[model samples]
Target chain A: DSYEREDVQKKTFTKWVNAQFSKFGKQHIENLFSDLQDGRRLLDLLEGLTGQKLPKEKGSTRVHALNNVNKALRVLQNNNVDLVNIGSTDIVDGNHKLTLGLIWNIILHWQVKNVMKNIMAGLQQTNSEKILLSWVRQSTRNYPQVNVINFTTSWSDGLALNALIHSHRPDLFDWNSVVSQQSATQRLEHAFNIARYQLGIEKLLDPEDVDTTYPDKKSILMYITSLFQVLPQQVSIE
Target chain B: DSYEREDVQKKTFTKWVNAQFSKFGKQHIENLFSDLQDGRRLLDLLEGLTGQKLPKEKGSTRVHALNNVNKALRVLQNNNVDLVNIGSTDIVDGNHKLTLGLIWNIILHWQVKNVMKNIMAGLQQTNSEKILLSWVRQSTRNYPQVNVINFTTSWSDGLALNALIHSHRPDLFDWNSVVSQQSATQRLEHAFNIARYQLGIEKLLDPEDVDTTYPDKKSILMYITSLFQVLPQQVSIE
Candidate 1:
């Protein structure tokens, strides 16, 4: 449990970062490590996660590079998001673990603290996974094919993903046919396609990533949160 | 030739209607005919296509129903979009031919006459197919895998569709890998998914529809035009 699926974590976080910056419909980050090392998109990602923008520093020297990365660090520091040993140097050097950790922290910060801010306040408590998992469970309660109590093995069959969409927009496709005859990958890919096209939701996770037995929890949550962000969030405070 | 591929036409246009009406992100039309028969969503779709407001008639009577349908008809007639045998009665009754005919007319009227109106004026000529066909051909010119001669078999191999997006945003995916390894249907599906998700272009055709020997021209044009409408249309006079 100490070392999560790093590859899965990187891919999922990369997509989430791209989704965050896609508001600009600007440059996309192909590799999380190499891309964020520049401190350019790192700053953009910060602006996307936090509404505030920092004046971009010029000059591509060592000092200038650290200055750009620290813009977000200072903002994070003010918000009580303290980095233990990580600093502008590790960030500008694009230390993969450090970069991934920063994004994971921001994911929790924005998703739980901001995206669910309104709901969390009313409920008077929160843990990012529990809230999101509880959301998937309650929203898809009526769909018998899914028993999505957690974000891992619960989605391996692929029916759970389909159920979340079918729960909302049954008219989009025949869920009965999908549940009856489709392969796990087919069901998973079909749900991703339909969700992106019909519902205008982004594909936060691909079929191969979720069809495996040990699907990454954070990867699954990234996608589920995407759905929550787009769809009219149904309230079920449990 | 006179009849057109009614089944493919319906499927493609139905998706288009949803894309247009999705601005409201309101009710989706499952069966264009039966759904529009109520004349409620018909008004919404009209407002979607044309930015004109048509006060919906609340009563569900024949007269009230005719009134609701006529609102769109009147707006159509005013814009020189004259229909031959189609009437408020035919539309309110959801006569398949008349309904399809009305949409086809609006599609050309809006797509050719409205969407590309500025470009057409600057260039001094237009045919809905020619403009769109020319756009696809010119955009994907460098990509040798595609020779998009027409809206029919040009897209059958699916390389042309991929070429267009690759031409615009080459960073999104690996064009070389897909070209060498993937199947035609795979290419088609991948293109549609990427177009919708990454570029935020709506899907206007399915893999099976375009993968076969004889693809519908209008259907193919519909999807291609969707790409044109969304992407930054690179200007070319020829």
Candidate 2:
């Protein structure tokens, strides 16, 4: 088993719902997850919240059941929850697998940012501070609207297809081996210089400042904010 | 002549900002309008807020002024404002115009939803209710993540280019004479039908609901919310 214990799964799902609702607000959450078509897990969660069995008679189709479940979930959005396993018979279906893939993307997107932030914090110790700052500034220049400037992995169509497959069918994904890695300091240095040149910032500032000490986050954040001047953190200034 | 009166412009800009900030959180606003690069109008707003002249002494470049201004604007994001005009000399520059175009897209995206909601309300009367409902359901079938389904004016390369021009340099855009438009009802019908067929929802339902009374906003909204399950309106059901 790839699935977690039943209780643990319930706890995690509940926590996930609470945190997501708090962060995005109800409207956005509804927008993101439309009940137009949902699966059994959602219905179970709905049942757990409502404490009432839905009208699923012999003649009822899955579509009708789903519609009624969605209605119940709408009301339950206000209720608190507690619920999943990574793999099991329940996860081997159509929309259940799709739901898992979406969840994985959200989790990975969040994890990626944390990893970058931690990496940045670590780089502040060594003589790699300048490289860290420069890379952050450069990654943001082209697509400032994106909060995290992805310097670790260069995304491509091929990579995206692989990610899609990995998300949809996690059982087939190799978690125990085939690890790909990058050196933090080396990545910092290479990405920084590359982003700087591409953004045309290498010529703007003195080579000395571009080459040196820990720059203040406030100064950099403020400078980048004004330079491109779209909306502060959303749009990056190159 | 194409620009608004100065006082009127200031008042409109202030109101625009107040509404935007209240709708989107402070961080999102900052993210969308990164200070990395700003314009003269933003600098003016910064000056009004701080009551301090930016250091534009002898050797200081426009870049320096923008950095200082952005720093000030960050402080003001917490401080509410009341905020734009479409065109003029200030809108003619590099990133300023670009920023306007981006902002225009954002405003349009926001406005498009309201338009759809209103149209949905109007369509409940005639033999258009089912068509409208079917269309909304179909459009969101694939991309459940999108909150608002764009119904009016299909977005194309040509339309985008036109929008870019209209937003970037509104001074050159015709306002007095030439007008291109579409009826709300007619647009609703065409877009709904096109989207339904394209999304493969045409064969799914009957035309009975199409010719009926107006639907309640609550029911339609509830239906939509359930129709697409995603980030609780923020993420998506997958």
Candidate 3:
């Protein structure tokens, strides 16, 4: 179940990095995990996000790869960005899960500003979760199914996903039927399918992931933020 | 009313061109008409599409612009593309409408393959029009409204547009009232609005534009192709 969450994050981050590297015309990222192990594209990604040119080692050895990746990590740190659980060796050695985590850190600190800047006048360090959380709550305020006061327990039943997708694309499906008639798993699967195929948003969760007392919060956030990314709703700029 | 059709074509082509120029990283296009009059980005676009580097005049003069654009036109002609009513002078003088036409010529021939290739196999010279026309008919076969026999007259009542969307997202609204109840222009405006706001597809056809017997066919084609481009569904591989 968690592997699906990890898979969605990897795909999302890869596509996001591709969007960032658009200016570098010839550089296309087909595989994020393996392509980034060498750290050249990683430095390229940092430059693309921050608009700062980063240097790397010329040699093709482990030390060279470490130096190159370390240079990128330093750029992420010294250039007014996140200082988190990351090391140059961790990325250079290709730990798949931590690679995704480090990329999310970069997204959280640097690239997220590109999206958050439009919605908020000034973005704070820890306000992104609240921004997206507020978006889920305030956006689905009209839904009659459930209240999403927290991403932890509120999403376990999957009605929040129904409200979120239905609210954005009411024509895609009927929430009334799902809430009143369908089972919990049916409600969850319906929304996930609609998001994946109908709306083109990646399905970041399965019913098993959600029908628990504690669903994965990061996965939940990732899924909803993608909704915000694609199906744009008019928001009040503050 | 027809001005909106021309305006939508401009926006669609501009956005499409921006997507092509994504590889060039820093060369962002703000004004398609004015920016393309210089002819440098025109050559850059040809390179982006055909993956062939083209020669251009270096001087910042009309002759140089025409020379650069002429070379691009030659590239289009000799290396396999359209042979239309395009002259280098027409583009260099910045005839806004003709610029859009030429770009459509380019898209129909070159960039459309990037999209159509996945859905289609062995794209013929002029089959994109019929390909989309068949898609309109086949995709909405069971609508029980009006037949989409032709783009010109078939769209005038807007039932076909309703059928196209309702067939895709059945939950958006009711077709019973639209088919048996609403006035001609109301039905037209309703479909256009849902396509614009809810589905994120641009409202290319105004009620007045579509309510005519001879609706602009290229504009109709331009609008529908955009729908196909974004809202993808499962199609037969062959």
Candidate 4:
């Protein structure tokens, strides 16, 4: 049913918004839109914040409508407005694109969160052992060696946290060994390897390059040719 | 620059709507919403047409708004309402998701169109040579050998088209030869090969399963476990 789907999307949108606030923290979000008053030209406010202007002629109404939608998103992400409190279900016809994109982002993050959680949990379980049943003897493994990292909604910002853990305490995540029957170590290893590489650590063992490798060069070059055809020839460097 | 992006998207949406009408024909679209008059209860009309009910209790207003937007789309696609003639740029404060989805579909189709055009052009150029200089030499090549398949906005639907071409007409596309420096043939060939396999044509000699091969079963199973954690366990079959 249309309404059933709407209800699901509303819940999803709310969760995503809340997760953004939790991940980015209120201060960071506030800083994004601190210059604009709530009652002022919200579109112009977004323009100033994002350094991008809305078209004022021809499709200006559409431009303004889309810009307003974008501004709401900025506010939603900025933590100025509580998403939990926002009437997200009050969707209008023009702003469907913004909501769809937000929903897509939520799904993307949800998948990422699940992957991270499974991988981290696998590492935690396999890396740790039940406290040795010793009545009179103490164990060297006082604290659990593997630290379970919480998956945040903001995948990009969350990566920074992963890096923090990787850099300061590499042991928090297991780079070696299989944790589950369908191990997350491989994926996590790839994630960390990329994260480490991004942090300027040049040499990574068994580098994870899944994101970059797909479609291969043949596909990419073909796409480029097709792009050149539709767009002006001036856009091409060669 | 943001407005520039919006302008591009607006054009893209119009093109997509036009393409849909051209592809699906005017009569087929008219049938989708044939029961309702232009200004009547659009949501109910759609529900009746599609045999799905909209939620009238909680988010009925939003549902109606979305349904109306969809009806507008139907009208636009029916060749009666010109997207060019319509005020496409008029911005609404809601319905962001619908617009976003439409925009996304346009991009997807645009890419597919470009790829098909490039590949077909390449095939045409190489496979056939203008019959050697007899001013009135009758040619056997009456029709364009490779029909440029138009991609639907739905990614899966688009892929299915790709598969259909691959499975039914393998010889029309080349896998072995490099048609250009930035070859589209190889990529198209790969897309079709995998598509063919997905359509259960296991006889594909060299499969192009690059998209799904990565992360492997280990990663997929981990994702399943994670999914179980968030969703009800009973939902998971295995």
Candidate 4 lDDT, tens digit per residue, B3-88?
Answer: 12333333333433334444434222221222222223333333433455434333334454444555545643552322332222
Model 1's CAPRI class is incorrect
Q: Can you write out model 1's per-residue Cα lDDT over A1-78, one digit (the tens) per residue?
A: 132445545765665566667766667889888776657776777776667877787756778888888887888877
Model 3, span A46-130: residue lDDT tens: 7776778787778678888988888888887776666576787788888887788777667545533332232122222224455
Residue B82 CA error for candidate 4 (Å)? 73
Query: How much lDDT does candidate 3 score?
Result: 0.67
| lDDT (10s digit) by residue, model 2, range B49-155 | 34665442221456554554444344344333211332222232334443444333233333322322332233333232233333343343443222322221222
Please identify which of the two predictions, 1 or 3, would achieve the higher lDDT against the true structure. Answer: 1
Q: How well does candidate 3 reproduce the true complex, by DockQ?
A: 0.01
Model 2 CA deviation exceeding 4 Å by range:
A1-207, A228-238, B1-49, B52-222, B226-230, B235-238
Between candidates 1 and 2, the TM-score winner? 1
Whole-model Cα lDDT per candidate?
0.68, 0.31, 0.67, 0.31
Task: Flag clash pairs in model 1.
Answer: none
Q: Tell me the lDDT of candidate 1.
A: 0.68
Give the best candidate by lDDT. 1
Q: What is residue A146's positional error in candidate 3, in angstroms?
A: 28
Candidate 1 on B60-98: residue-level lDDT in tens?
688888888788778878877858888888877768878
Give the residue spans of candidate 1 off by over 4 A. A1-238, B112-118, B121-238
Q: DockQ for the candidate 4 complex?
A: 0.01
Residue pairs clashing, model 3: A23-B25, A25-B23, A171-B171, A171-B172
Residue-wise C-alpha lDDT for candidate 4, range A1-238, written one tens digit per residue: 1112333333333433334444434221221122121212334333333456543222334344444555555554663332432222222232343344443443333443443334233323321111111100111112232332211111122232233334334654652322231333344454445444543322212211112222122122222223234322110000
lDDT of 1 at A189: 81
